[PDB]
Amino acid sequence: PSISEIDRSYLLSSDRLTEVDGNTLDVASEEQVAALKAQFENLKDGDEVVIPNGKYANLGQVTITANDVTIRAEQAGAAWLTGLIQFELKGDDITLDGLVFTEGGPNERFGAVRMMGNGNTLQNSTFYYFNHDYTYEPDERRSEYPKYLWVSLWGKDGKVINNRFEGKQKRGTLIGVQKDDTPDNHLIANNIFMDQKPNQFNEFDIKEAIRYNGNSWEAIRIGDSKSSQWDSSSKFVNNLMIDMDGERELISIKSGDNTISGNTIFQSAALISLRHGKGNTVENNMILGNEKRLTGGIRIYDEDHVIRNNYIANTRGRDGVIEGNADLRGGIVINTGIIDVANGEQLDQSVKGKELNKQWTPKNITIENNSLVDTEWGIVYGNQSHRVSLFNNAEVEGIYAGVDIAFKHNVVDNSQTPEFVSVRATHDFPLVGATYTDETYVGQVTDSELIESYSVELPKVTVENGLNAYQGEGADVSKLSVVTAETAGPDYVLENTTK
Numbered sequence: 485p486s487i488s489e490i491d492r493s494y495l496l497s498s499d500r501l502t503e504v505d506g507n508t509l510d511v512a513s514e515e516q517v518a519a520l521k522a523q524f525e526n527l528k529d530g531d532e533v534v535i536p537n538g539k540y541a542n543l544g545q546v547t548i549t550a551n552d553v554t555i556r557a558e559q560a561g562a563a564w565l566t567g568l569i570q571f572e573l574k575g576d577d578i579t580l581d582g583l584v585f586t587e588g589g590p591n592e593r594f595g596a597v598r599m600m601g602n603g604n605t606l607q608n609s610t611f612y613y614f615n616h617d618y619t620y621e622p623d624e625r626r627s628e629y630p631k632y633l634w635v636s637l638w639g640k641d642g643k644v645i646n647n648r649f650e651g652k653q654k655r656g657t658l659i660g661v662q663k664d665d666t667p668d669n670h671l672i673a674n675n676i677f678m679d680q681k682p683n684q685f686n687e688f689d690i691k692e693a694i695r696y697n698g699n700s701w702e703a704i705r706i707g708d709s710k711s712s713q714w715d716s717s718s719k720f721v722n723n724l725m726i727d728m729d730g731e732r733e734l735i736s737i738k739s740g741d742n743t744i745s746g747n748t749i750f751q752s753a754a755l756i757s758l759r760h761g762k763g764n765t766v767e768n769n770m771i772l773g774n775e776k777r778l779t780g781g782i783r784i785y786d787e788d789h790v791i792r793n794n795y796i797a798n799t800r801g802r803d804g805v806i807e808g809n810a811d812l813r814g815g816i817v818i819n820t821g822i823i824d825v826a827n828g829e830q831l832d833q834s835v836k837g838k839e840l841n842k843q844w845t846p847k848n849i850t851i852e853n854n855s856l857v858d859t860e861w862g863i864v865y866g867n868q869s870h871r872v873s874l875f876n877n878a879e880v881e882g883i884y885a886g887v888d889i890a891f892k893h894n895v896v897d898n899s900q901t902p903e904f905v906s907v908r909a910t911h912d913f914p915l916v917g918a919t920y921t922d923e924t925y926v927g928q929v930t931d932s933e934l935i936e937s938y939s940v941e942l943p944k945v946t947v948e949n950g951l952n953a954y955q956g957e958g959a960d961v962s963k964l965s966v967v968t969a970e971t972a973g974p975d976y977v978l979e980n981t982t983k
Contacts (some may be wrong), residue, residue, distance in 0.1 A: 506559035506980040535563035542567035551575040561976035580969040586612035595633040613651035631656035637886040667717035676973035701730030707739025709841035712760035715741035724972040733757035756900035773799035780813035810868035821845030855958035862896040885913035895958030897957030898927025
């Protein structure tokens with residue numbers, strides 16, 4: 485298909501995929517489940533457990549202390565682990581391969597797979613609507629629903645590769661990186677993520693609790709506010725994401741030196757979010773909104789990031805549905821923050837109101853060689869108000885615009901619908917120290933007098949592999965390719981699943 489014609493059937497198609505029919509699998513008896521669990525916890529270093537085709541309910545807490553072990557399905561996709569389970573991987577160099585988690589839920593809130601050792605790997609595995617069997621009630625303190633993860637990484641050199649993460653529809657990030665003060669060097673690559681979405685269980689009906697119950701539905705969170713001033717050096721690369729609509733943050737980066745690159749993000753009403761931490765790079769992504777409401781590209785806080793050679797097309801919408809969370813959408817959004825970074829101010833846990841979980845005004849951001857095509861809101865200069873916290877609805881006083889934002893060789897092409905806003909500048913929050921080199925903006929530009937110069941004539945346009953290529957400007961199409969099931973996700977698809 486051409487870009488506009490892409491659909492999930494196309495993205496999910498590959499001749500390499502085997503079909504596994506769950507209705508051919510026998511249900512293991514309680515004695516068989518117990519015997520399998522003993523195999524797991526009795527492993528010697530270097531051994532392997534091959535799980536016979538079948539469905540194994542309620543394995544519960546499975547602690548692997550052995551090093552250099554593999555737990556794999558006899559046939560990939562044909563060992564279905566249902567009811568409550570958590571693999572707590574404590575040894576090093578443990579690989580889980582070919583497993584299915586469905587019709588059940590995590591035995592503990594940090595996931596079905598707690599990757600605690602070093603060199604741990606989760607590969608060729610499928611989660612299918614693993615939202616069940618755990619208590620899920622608004623708490624007494626503030627009617628907050630519990631956050632459950634599917635996978636967490638707590639060690640070093642983790643790999644989460646060639647999996648399928650489908651249908652996360654209760655609160656909590658899908659993959660969480662729980663890090664310390666040194667780099668982690670995790671690789672989250674070549675996975676398929678589909679159909680994460682919130683408010684399937686009326687959670688938003690408790691109106692007073694919506695700003696926090698509507699948060700923590702990310703596909704991945706890399707770090708956290710406390711650890712955000714350290715490098716993770718992790719990679720979220722070459723993934724395929726389809727209808728990932730959890731919350732304003734699709735990928736929430738909360739640490740430094742990360743790479744969020746080469747992903748295809750299709751019809752996902754959620755943004756790449758540089759939320760805390762410095763020096764992250766977002767490059768060569770294909771963000772295909774396909775005219776879906778509240779799609780968008782990248783939102784930016786904090787310092788030293790590089791946003792380069794992304795292709796962001798057919799995105800729609802500006803204002804998220806939940807107020808008070810600075811949920812301002814577009815192709816590339818330069819957020820306001822609450823600190824005077826132009827005068828060297830930092831977030832600092834010691835300073836009341838400017839703690840590490842607050843909003844670090846962006847500074848020293850390079851935004852270069854991006855192509856934004858038919859984006860209803862293209863490059864958006866922020867004007868958000870910020871509240872004290874997700875729990876305290878008072879408005880913060882003292883709001884600051886991005887500083888030292890360098891724009892070079894971007895193309896924002898709204899030639900098709902020039903009433904769309906290619907660049908949303910605003911006198912309410914003028915960027916400080918912004919620079920413009922060979923920018924091309926076609927379509928509406930608000931408060932345009934704030935921008936030193938730009939061209940309104942497109943360079944020669946050609947189409948290469950269905951992408952628009954702009955002569956000498958914008959995203960180099962030779963660095964771009966659509967990720968499909970040809971390389972992403974496991975080597976099988978499942979039949980006779982149940983949500």
